[PDB]
Symmetry: D2
Subunit: 127 residues, 4 copies
């Protein structure tokens, strides 16, 4: 099933949707990075979306400390897999994670060949 | 808890999000209509979004027959409730429901004061 | 400027884009209605987007009085003429206009088969 | 036309809009990078959006060669100057350009504090 660096009560979740087919975007590769002290993007977690277009178990709460994170979504592979030429090489979401703010982070991405929209839902409850 | 005309294995679900606060849009009124024989919008189901920004139990499968449906979202009340002047009177989603197509319908709406995006996810599994 | 029904400084303009092809949505039919005293939609103006995906000259400043307007974009025909059976019947934007004096409104829509985004840009004329 | 680094027919243009105020996003800093032979991002061009939310003259057609480019929009500064702590650090659009000959690219972004949409309009020059 879905997983990542550390499957636990998801502090970070990714949901990807397909605006052309009206369906979840399945088997889409997602790579998470953490900005290191030297400003380089340290690999953090990675995975592929499930049949429901979701990626959970990426990280556990112990290791999800405040910092700058980058979620890279391989949208090009996805569109190539459907016979459609896309515009973007990938879609990235860069944000800061702070403790004062709600605990859970859901990054949602809605995809089209020449356009993508992303939203963040920060909460306290589950999902 | 959440409900509507007939709470069952949700053939139709609504999910509303707030792009300004990064949270689900709670207590948002949603009215569903069915185009009648005389082309008027017959009231069909209605409700308010839950704490998770979702509305389920709107209809049951027996009564969700092929037809043209309209989902009206009272976005103006929502923004007025936050001290923000919105542009739209409401957001409507009009679509045809056909049996050949997947069984489940999830209408998602992402809201901002002067802009809204809506997507449909049509599937066979749950959600 | 252009009184009667022309377009003084063009108070109402529509811009449609295609998220699947990365281009303006050409020849999209647009119908505008104004809410009449009797609470019914009265035909106000109509046209089709140009090669640039824009629609100008829908109304003159003199006739564009305060009121509730509905801009209906025939998205279904557009996608069908491309061989795609889309989800929505059309896209509708309903808003109150000119309540605090005359303004210039630009309604933009970004189209995908199972999704659409709309935003409004409201300017205060200066000439 | 304008060779060197000006803008012949303006091959690269950025348009930024604000979904919370219903207006162009003025004075937004934009940085463009090109992927160098060594797989590192090299500074290619930069500027700020005008009162219309547009950024023109970033490059000339002669210097806008085939390559992978990254358009970085400083969304964080924009929202902060408005008193809002937004979710994202910035918005980045990465794409391959001019691989099948020269084209005109228009990168559009619609901004909200916890969300952004981006689309591309690619035109084939004729003059």
């Amino acid at each position: 099933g879905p997983t990542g660096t550390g499957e636990s009560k998801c502090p970070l979740m990714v949901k990807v949707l397909d605006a052309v087919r009206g369906s979840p975007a399945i088997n889409v590769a997602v790579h998470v990075f953490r900005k290191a002290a030297d400003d380089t993007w340290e690999p953090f977690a990675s995975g592929k979306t499930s049949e429901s277009g979701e990626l959970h178990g990426l990280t556990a709460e112990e290791e999800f400390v405040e910092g700058i994170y980058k979620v890279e979504i391989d949208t090009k592979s996805y569109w190539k897999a459907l016979g459609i030429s896309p515009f973007h090489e990938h879609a990235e979401v860069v944000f800061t994670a702070n403790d004062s703010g709600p605990r859970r982070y859901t990054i949602a991405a809605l995809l089209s060949p020449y356009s993508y929209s992303t939203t963040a839902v920060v909460t306290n409850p589950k999902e």
